[PDB]
Amino acid sequence: GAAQPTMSVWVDYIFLDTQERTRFAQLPHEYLIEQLQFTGSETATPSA
Amino acid sequence: VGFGNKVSTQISRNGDLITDIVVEFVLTKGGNGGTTYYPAEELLQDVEL
Amino acid sequence: ATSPAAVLGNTETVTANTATLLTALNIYAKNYNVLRIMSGMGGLAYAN
Amino acid sequence: AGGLSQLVAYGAQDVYLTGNPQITFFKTVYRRYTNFAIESIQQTINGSVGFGNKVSTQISRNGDLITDIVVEFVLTKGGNGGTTYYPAEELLQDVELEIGGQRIDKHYNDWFRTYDALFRMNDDRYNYRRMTDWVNNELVGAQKRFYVPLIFFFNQTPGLALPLIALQYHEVKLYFTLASQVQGVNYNGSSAIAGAAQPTMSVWVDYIFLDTQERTRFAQLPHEYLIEQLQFTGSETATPSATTQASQNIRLNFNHPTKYLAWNFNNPTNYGQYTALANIPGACSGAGTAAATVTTPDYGNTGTYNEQLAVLDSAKIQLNGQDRFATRKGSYFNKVQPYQSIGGVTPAGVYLYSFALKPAGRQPSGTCNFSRIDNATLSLTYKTCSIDATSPAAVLGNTETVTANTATLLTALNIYAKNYNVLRIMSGMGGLAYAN
Amino acid sequence: GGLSQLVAYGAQDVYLTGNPQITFFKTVYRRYTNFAIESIQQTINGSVGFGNKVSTQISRNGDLITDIVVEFVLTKGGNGGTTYYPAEELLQDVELEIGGQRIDKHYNDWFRTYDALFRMNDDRYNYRRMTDWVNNELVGAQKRFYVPLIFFFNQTPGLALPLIALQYHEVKLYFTLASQVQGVNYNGSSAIAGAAQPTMSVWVDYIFLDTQERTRFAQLPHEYLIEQLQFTGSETATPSATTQASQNIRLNFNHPTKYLAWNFNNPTNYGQYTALANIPGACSGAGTAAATVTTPDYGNTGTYNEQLAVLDSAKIQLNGQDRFATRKGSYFNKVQPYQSIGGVTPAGVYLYSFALKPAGRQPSGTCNFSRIDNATLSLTYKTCSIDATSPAAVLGNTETVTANTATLLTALNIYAKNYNVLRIMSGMGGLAYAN
Amino acid sequence: AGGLSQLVAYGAQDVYLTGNPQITFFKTVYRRYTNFAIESIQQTINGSVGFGNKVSTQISRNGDLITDIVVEFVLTKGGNGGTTYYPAEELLQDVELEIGGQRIDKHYNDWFRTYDALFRMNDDRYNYRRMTDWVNNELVGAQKRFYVPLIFFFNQTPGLALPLIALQYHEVKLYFTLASQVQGVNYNGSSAIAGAAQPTMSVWVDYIFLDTQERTRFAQLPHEYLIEQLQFTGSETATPSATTQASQNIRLNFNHPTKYLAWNFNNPTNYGQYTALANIPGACSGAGTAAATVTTPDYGNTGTYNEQLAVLDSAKIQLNGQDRFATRKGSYFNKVQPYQSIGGVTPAGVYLYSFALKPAGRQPSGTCNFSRIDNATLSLTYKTCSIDATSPAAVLGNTETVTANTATLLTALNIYAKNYNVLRIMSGMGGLAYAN
Amino acid sequence: PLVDNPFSTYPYKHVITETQPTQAKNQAIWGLVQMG
């Protein structure tokens, strides 16, 4: 009898001004960013 | 949307920059106090940008 | 695992028999890249 | 009226098909070739021929170029109908291609079964069985002549024939390792068959004779051949028993431009067995009767198309730490990939992922050059082996993430890669340009 | 040895080896454009379920689109033999459009017809594995199914969709799912209680091109020669006795057509193109006291016994005149596909070609129905007088009669396969010739 | 990640694969072709149609070129299910094509059986059976329309279509002889069947019509076609009943550059029987039960694959006293030779040796020119017919050097040569450039 | 190589003359429909 979820994704947007939007869309950008890299594996917990 | 399914969100160009994204769920549990542990966190198994 | 006298009363080199269920190994690495946005396009400058 | 009713139906829409014709379908011109003759002769085998023995032969230089090689065996079976499964392919444990003292390629009996599982398609597969197995309900005591063709890069097309006339300083030799155990001939499972006959073998090569103008060019001019190699190491599996879906991250050791990766999950004790065994028709010895035993296959029908008996749940390949494609279930690699890339049916338990649009051919059609991939990993997830193999109701009646308890016998993972290299022939000596 | 014939060169063999142009044993292979192939998942817009219609927009991940495979996960509700290609009958149809402009559309009945007519050898057996249960699987069994699509760009990389150059008109696929799937949520007309809904996912195989080719695709115009499938359903009626009815069907086709194909089916039992009869594989329980000729032994619905077929003869007319003299239906079921395809066609599926080699994509002769004012398909039917329950007559009567159960093959499906041209300029494109 | 990750894995081993390229795989090219229409009309037959009758038909010059000739039969059988074996093919006994008074190509029902047995290699063979025989257990009294296509040099590819428009002064005729004895319709073995109706026959010919502009140019120009013909003479076998592996040295009478030789060992009473009959499933009438008789076949299963039932042990071709290749076993010529040459299944009892690399195709690829070879022979060595055909223990459980005692019933030998020559047509007349 | 058929090419002439955002280079535009 478990119900299905309701899902919505909400996004916080930034609006800029007249001169900033003109320059922002026209100029190239270089952002220094993070990434996560990951592959799951198997461990070796011993018995005794 | 449902359990075990896969959906995507395409970002509308609603603003000039996009910064903070939060995923909203409505859940009802079938168990008692102490039977859950971050149920909204495990709910989202693999999210890709 | 069923006797707290043994679980709360031992040395650093041992643990509970129930510990053998921790079979999934998850090793994460967080890293830098550069997000290079030129002419309306984005992407990763350095990646393999 | 008649055909002319279409011929006169000339409009605007069809002009781009019939205006200013370049091709007429009805007047063919055939290109003229240079005279040659094909001859097939035997070579002397150096070494004692038998079970577990390794022998070699040097290709007698009766030709200008070599196109095909067939290994012939005489076997007598110690069992009856259904007790054998490609006994000639199993006996041919491996074959090494050597040109000038260095290794070019080496194929293993399991590779031949995999190639047959993937790329030898149509009723032609039936000939393959006919040349390698007992397919007419033969009984114990029967003796038969078998033909195991080799599948080196130059064996299926004349275009890469080995131009021996141009290798006048190098020997080309074939090394044949014969199996110590062959199911139904000297062993039935692990039980020795008393009185089993020692096999007899001969090696035959198809030589091409060229005429005066063409063989002169071959002898004096250098050559660069685009050839194929097999890369292989046999890996171990972690097939789960119950309550869990185990996974592995198998590190791959490949280099050179690769056409495709293929793999199977073998039962090392039963040649060519790539799936679980069950108490259903063709799935185990005695299946359907009170004598059914799920630990021993009904060997002649070892191969199946029953997905429930295949062990793989899902797979993905990672290159240099990155996803190469999204995760697929095992049923993808033994259906969608051979369907799109080959156009035949692949028996359950054999899987293929191609990088090539047409891996069945020789014309390069896309490659994975592992010379620039520093860490290649094949990630596998297994189905849980919780179905009781003895219950037809549970084997023909359950879900996509489980298989039978007998799948845990599939302890060996055989990963194959086919690649391109260049065989340069210069001043009578041959060799590969790219070594790794 | 071989030199014994090599020296035996003469006069008449000059036409074979005089002044050679080629040598067979040193083949030079061509160097190609660097690319990579990747298959990724597309998301489905809409609720996936029986009788529902959903759409998929194909994302812009790569440069070219080639193979698209629809993956369905089904649980059967019956025993072995109660299913007959569930995956593709569920895939009721797929509509292809670019920027809202229809390019093509395929129907579940066509997928069965194409699989029955052009796909051949073990390839078709593999297909069966991809769409059906072939090991006598029982109730509750789950299998993942793959239904490859057969649009003009799906079978050869040479006609792949130039996403680079299709910037302003998105590529979309609309998927209509069947309300009834035999052996999964219905058994005949009866609902199967507890049957699960299908899970579906659309996989798209992308090609990634290197630097110079991408530029070339982005700046140069393109002309691709593509196929279309033309279809609408028709109605027919075959008499039970005393007569062989004729029927004249007005065709509504346009564009250079390389073949026409058609079948006669029972609209309730998917893929049934022949009458059912009390002979092995021809009906449920066939050969036993329980044999019933109104319900098929579904997993064997397809047969090769044309005496269960309804068609007697057929003739194609153009503008009031005969194209060829009337020929019996068995010509169109067994010989035309021998001449034009090379495989084997099951009974009830018929082909007539205008092309020499319609199986291939290189054009080989067409009938452009755009210059024809009246194209008519004339049919003559067999008299449905054989008692389907008596093998004595079903396996032993004359060529002009068929089973009484053949009167249920009332759905007449006539397909036309034609050429059009997909032309791309300045970031967008579409088909040059409409009608 | 994914494809872009793979795309950049570019290095030294790619310079010969993707560097300085000539082609792409992602843009195909179609060609604009001469406008034509296809037509099919029925030809009349001059003469009385019946069993043992000779009839002929002249092809009406309605079209410009002829591409495909299909002969229709309507037959009613007097036997039960499994008592027939290609009755339409046995009936179409002799077919020959005459151009202007000269014969250029002749085919026999036994050849058609060999072609179906050798070159049809998939669904095509099944479909061929479908239109030549009954395949759905039909009972006595059933009637069926049969379609027996002819295989003249122009009946498979449009490129050699016979250009009637350039043969303004010649008659083109098809001469037919229909078999007097057809199994299951007029005779059951040797016994006549009462109530055996005569066949209904007509011949359907597929015409090509060309557009006026290229039809005029096509008709006016002289033409040469490189075409293939069948050469054939009958022979006799030398099959002993015991203790001896008999040999016979057959002198061959063939001419012209030949692609291959093919031969079969036929029971002259039972059409298409190329093996011994035996009391094993499918190998004789009643096989497997007490009524089994090894002298009469289970006709519907006449074609089998168990070479144990073969009569031929080995064969060798010699040219002017020299071995053409070393002596090989019959299983070589039945199984692996067509694997190498054509790529498909051949039933037991049919043997070939190919001079061409790929004789299945029409592009010339190596021929043996018997117009310059004076003395070509074919040496056959038979198996010892020491197996008791009635005992499965001996039929299914013996060595390759022996065959069934019923192999002695195989008394006719048929050796075929398929070969090239040139068809020349000028100013309304044509014929072959070279005799024989 | 293609002829202009006045009864079949009109839908094509229509779409290839449809207004599209071809001047969206380095523009600050709120809505761009999945261009590429």
PDB file of N, CA, C and O in Angstrom, chain B residues 10-43:
ATOM      1  N   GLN B  10      15.207  19.367 -17.719  1.00  0.00           N
ATOM      2  CA  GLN B  10      15.976  20.194 -18.633  1.00  0.00           C
ATOM      3  C   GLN B  10      15.841  21.570 -18.006  1.00  0.00           C
ATOM      4  O   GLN B  10      14.758  21.941 -17.537  1.00  0.00           O
ATOM      5  N   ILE B  11      16.963  22.279 -17.931  1.00  0.00           N
ATOM      6  CA  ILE B  11      16.992  23.613 -17.340  1.00  0.00           C
ATOM      7  C   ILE B  11      16.563  24.685 -18.321  1.00  0.00           C
ATOM      8  O   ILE B  11      17.206  24.903 -19.356  1.00  0.00           O
ATOM      9  N   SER B  12      15.455  25.352 -18.000  1.00  0.00           N
ATOM     10  CA  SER B  12      14.956  26.407 -18.850  1.00  0.00           C
ATOM     11  C   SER B  12      15.865  27.593 -18.615  1.00  0.00           C
ATOM     12  O   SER B  12      16.374  27.791 -17.512  1.00  0.00           O
ATOM     13  N   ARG B  13      16.084  28.390 -19.646  1.00  0.00           N
ATOM     14  CA  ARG B  13      16.897  29.583 -19.460  1.00  0.00           C
ATOM     15  C   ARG B  13      16.082  30.749 -18.904  1.00  0.00           C
ATOM     16  O   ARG B  13      16.001  31.819 -19.518  1.00  0.00           O
ATOM     17  N   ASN B  14      15.524  30.537 -17.702  1.00  0.00           N
ATOM     18  CA  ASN B  14      14.645  31.362 -16.884  1.00  0.00           C
ATOM     19  C   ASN B  14      15.382  32.540 -16.279  1.00  0.00           C
ATOM     20  O   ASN B  14      14.739  33.523 -15.926  1.00  0.00           O
ATOM     21  N   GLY B  15      16.696  32.440 -16.146  1.00  0.00           N
ATOM     22  CA  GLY B  15      17.498  33.485 -15.558  1.00  0.00           C
ATOM     23  C   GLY B  15      18.784  33.546 -16.349  1.00  0.00           C
ATOM     24  O   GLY B  15      18.939  32.876 -17.368  1.00  0.00           O
ATOM     25  N   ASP B  16      19.701  34.382 -15.879  1.00  0.00           N
ATOM     26  CA  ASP B  16      20.961  34.540 -16.594  1.00  0.00           C
ATOM     27  C   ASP B  16      21.991  33.532 -16.109  1.00  0.00           C
ATOM     28  O   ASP B  16      22.792  33.020 -16.899  1.00  0.00           O
ATOM     29  N   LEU B  17      21.986  33.229 -14.820  1.00  0.00           N
ATOM     30  CA  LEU B  17      22.858  32.208 -14.272  1.00  0.00           C
ATOM     31  C   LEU B  17      21.969  31.278 -13.459  1.00  0.00           C
ATOM     32  O   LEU B  17      20.928  31.686 -12.935  1.00  0.00           O
ATOM     33  N   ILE B  18      22.355  30.017 -13.367  1.00  0.00           N
ATOM     34  CA  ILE B  18      21.693  29.061 -12.485  1.00  0.00           C
ATOM     35  C   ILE B  18      22.628  28.676 -11.348  1.00  0.00           C
ATOM     36  O   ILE B  18      23.779  28.284 -11.580  1.00  0.00           O
ATOM     37  N   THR B  19      22.133  28.774 -10.110  1.00  0.00           N
ATOM     38  CA  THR B  19      23.026  28.491  -8.993  1.00  0.00           C
ATOM     39  C   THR B  19      22.577  27.362  -8.065  1.00  0.00           C
ATOM     40  O   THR B  19      23.340  26.421  -7.926  1.00  0.00           O
ATOM     41  N   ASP B  20      21.410  27.400  -7.416  1.00  0.00           N
ATOM     42  CA  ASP B  20      21.106  26.443  -6.352  1.00  0.00           C
ATOM     43  C   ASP B  20      19.931  25.554  -6.740  1.00  0.00           C
ATOM     44  O   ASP B  20      18.815  26.041  -6.898  1.00  0.00           O
ATOM     45  N   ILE B  21      20.158  24.240  -6.858  1.00  0.00           N
ATOM     46  CA  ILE B  21      19.114  23.321  -7.306  1.00  0.00           C
ATOM     47  C   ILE B  21      18.787  22.365  -6.167  1.00  0.00           C
ATOM     48  O   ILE B  21      19.678  21.728  -5.593  1.00  0.00           O
ATOM     49  N   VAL B  22      17.501  22.301  -5.796  1.00  0.00           N
ATOM     50  CA  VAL B  22      17.006  21.468  -4.701  1.00  0.00           C
ATOM     51  C   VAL B  22      15.894  20.594  -5.263  1.00  0.00           C
ATOM     52  O   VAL B  22      14.996  21.063  -5.964  1.00  0.00           O
ATOM     53  N   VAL B  23      15.951  19.307  -4.940  1.00  0.00           N
ATOM     54  CA  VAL B  23      14.952  18.351  -5.397  1.00  0.00           C
ATOM     55  C   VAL B  23      13.966  18.095  -4.268  1.00  0.00           C
ATOM     56  O   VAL B  23      14.361  17.696  -3.165  1.00  0.00           O
ATOM     57  N   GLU B  24      12.695  18.334  -4.574  1.00  0.00           N
ATOM     58  CA  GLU B  24      11.515  18.300  -3.730  1.00  0.00           C
ATOM     59  C   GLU B  24      10.762  16.991  -3.883  1.00  0.00           C
ATOM     60  O   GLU B  24      10.342  16.656  -4.990  1.00  0.00           O
ATOM     61  N   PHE B  25      10.536  16.297  -2.769  1.00  0.00           N
ATOM     62  CA  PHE B  25       9.759  15.069  -2.689  1.00  0.00           C
ATOM     63  C   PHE B  25       8.636  15.196  -1.673  1.00  0.00           C
ATOM     64  O   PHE B  25       8.738  15.942  -0.700  1.00  0.00           O
ATOM     65  N   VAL B  26       7.573  14.434  -1.915  1.00  0.00           N
ATOM     66  CA  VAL B  26       6.479  14.177  -0.973  1.00  0.00           C
ATOM     67  C   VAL B  26       6.526  12.673  -0.766  1.00  0.00           C
ATOM     68  O   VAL B  26       6.414  11.908  -1.731  1.00  0.00           O
ATOM     69  N   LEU B  27       6.716  12.257   0.487  1.00  0.00           N
ATOM     70  CA  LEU B  27       6.746  10.857   0.891  1.00  0.00           C
ATOM     71  C   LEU B  27       5.882  10.578   2.098  1.00  0.00           C
ATOM     72  O   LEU B  27       5.793  11.405   2.999  1.00  0.00           O
ATOM     73  N   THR B  28       5.299   9.390   2.129  1.00  0.00           N
ATOM     74  CA  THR B  28       4.563   8.897   3.282  1.00  0.00           C
ATOM     75  C   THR B  28       5.215   7.566   3.649  1.00  0.00           C
ATOM     76  O   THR B  28       5.452   6.724   2.777  1.00  0.00           O
ATOM     77  N   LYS B  29       5.568   7.398   4.915  1.00  0.00           N
ATOM     78  CA  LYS B  29       6.233   6.162   5.290  1.00  0.00           C
ATOM     79  C   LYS B  29       5.244   5.119   5.798  1.00  0.00           C
ATOM     80  O   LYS B  29       4.190   5.427   6.358  1.00  0.00           O
ATOM     81  N   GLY B  30       5.618   3.859   5.592  1.00  0.00           N
ATOM     82  CA  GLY B  30       4.829   2.745   6.063  1.00  0.00           C
ATOM     83  C   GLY B  30       5.323   2.174   7.375  1.00  0.00           C
ATOM     84  O   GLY B  30       4.733   1.230   7.910  1.00  0.00           O
ATOM     85  N   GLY B  31       6.399   2.743   7.908  1.00  0.00           N
ATOM     86  CA  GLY B  31       6.978   2.240   9.137  1.00  0.00           C
ATOM     87  C   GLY B  31       6.806   3.186  10.305  1.00  0.00           C
ATOM     88  O   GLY B  31       6.231   4.268  10.159  1.00  0.00           O
ATOM     89  N   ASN B  32       7.303   2.789  11.472  1.00  0.00           N
ATOM     90  CA  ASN B  32       7.160   3.582  12.681  1.00  0.00           C
ATOM     91  C   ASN B  32       8.406   4.435  12.899  1.00  0.00           C
ATOM     92  O   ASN B  32       9.358   4.396  12.116  1.00  0.00           O
ATOM     93  N   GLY B  33       8.398   5.217  13.978  1.00  0.00           N
ATOM     94  CA  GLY B  33       9.558   6.011  14.350  1.00  0.00           C
ATOM     95  C   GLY B  33      10.814   5.169  14.478  1.00  0.00           C
ATOM     96  O   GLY B  33      10.809   4.129  15.158  1.00  0.00           O
ATOM     97  N   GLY B  34      11.894   5.603  13.838  1.00  0.00           N
ATOM     98  CA  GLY B  34      13.140   4.876  13.846  1.00  0.00           C
ATOM     99  C   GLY B  34      13.332   3.907  12.701  1.00  0.00           C
ATOM    100  O   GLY B  34      14.421   3.332  12.581  1.00  0.00           O
ATOM    101  N   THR B  35      12.326   3.707  11.859  1.00  0.00           N
ATOM    102  CA  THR B  35      12.456   2.789  10.738  1.00  0.00           C
ATOM    103  C   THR B  35      12.988   3.439   9.466  1.00  0.00           C
ATOM    104  O   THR B  35      13.191   2.730   8.480  1.00  0.00           O
ATOM    105  N   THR B  36      13.223   4.747   9.455  1.00  0.00           N
ATOM    106  CA  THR B  36      13.780   5.420   8.287  1.00  0.00           C
ATOM    107  C   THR B  36      15.143   6.020   8.607  1.00  0.00           C
ATOM    108  O   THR B  36      15.459   6.270   9.775  1.00  0.00           O
ATOM    109  N   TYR B  37      15.943   6.265   7.572  1.00  0.00           N
ATOM    110  CA  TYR B  37      17.276   6.852   7.713  1.00  0.00           C
ATOM    111  C   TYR B  37      17.567   7.537   6.395  1.00  0.00           C
ATOM    112  O   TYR B  37      17.908   6.841   5.434  1.00  0.00           O
ATOM    113  N   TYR B  38      17.434   8.865   6.370  1.00  0.00           N
ATOM    114  CA  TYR B  38      17.607   9.673   5.171  1.00  0.00           C
ATOM    115  C   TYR B  38      16.813   9.117   3.986  1.00  0.00           C
ATOM    116  O   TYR B  38      17.368   8.877   2.911  1.00  0.00           O
ATOM    117  N   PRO B  39      15.504   8.866   4.159  1.00  0.00           N
ATOM    118  CA  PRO B  39      14.710   8.312   3.060  1.00  0.00           C
ATOM    119  C   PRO B  39      14.642   9.182   1.841  1.00  0.00           C
ATOM    120  O   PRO B  39      14.426   8.639   0.762  1.00  0.00           O
ATOM    121  N   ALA B  40      14.815  10.497   1.948  1.00  0.00           N
ATOM    122  CA  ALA B  40      14.814  11.269   0.717  1.00  0.00           C
ATOM    123  C   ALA B  40      16.192  11.238   0.074  1.00  0.00           C
ATOM    124  O   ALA B  40      16.323  11.550  -1.114  1.00  0.00           O
ATOM    125  N   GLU B  41      17.223  10.841   0.827  1.00  0.00           N
ATOM    126  CA  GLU B  41      18.561  10.872   0.263  1.00  0.00           C
ATOM    127  C   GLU B  41      18.785   9.620  -0.542  1.00  0.00           C
ATOM    128  O   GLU B  41      19.334   9.694  -1.641  1.00  0.00           O
ATOM    129  N   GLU B  42      18.340   8.466  -0.027  1.00  0.00           N
ATOM    130  CA  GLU B  42      18.535   7.235  -0.772  1.00  0.00           C
ATOM    131  C   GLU B  42      17.580   7.181  -1.948  1.00  0.00           C
ATOM    132  O   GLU B  42      17.794   6.421  -2.890  1.00  0.00           O
ATOM    133  N   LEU B  43      16.549   8.007  -1.915  1.00  0.00           N
ATOM    134  CA  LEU B  43      15.525   7.959  -2.921  1.00  0.00           C
ATOM    135  C   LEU B  43      16.135   8.320  -4.249  1.00  0.00           C
ATOM    136  O   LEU B  43      15.762   7.727  -5.246  1.00  0.00           O
TER     137      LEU B  43
END
